[PDB]
Amino acid sequence: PLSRGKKWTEKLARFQRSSAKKKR
Numbered sequence: 001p002l003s004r005g006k007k008w009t010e011k012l013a014r015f016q017r018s019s020a021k022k023k024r
Contacts, residue, residue, distance in 0.1 A: 002009075
C-alpha cells in the first residue's frame with residue numbers, strides 16, 4: 001500500500017519543511 005509506497009512522497013513533505021529553515 002501507500003504506507004510503504006510513500007517512499008516517493010518522501011520528497012515534497014521532506015523538502016517542504018525547509019520553508020522553516022529558509023527564514024534564516
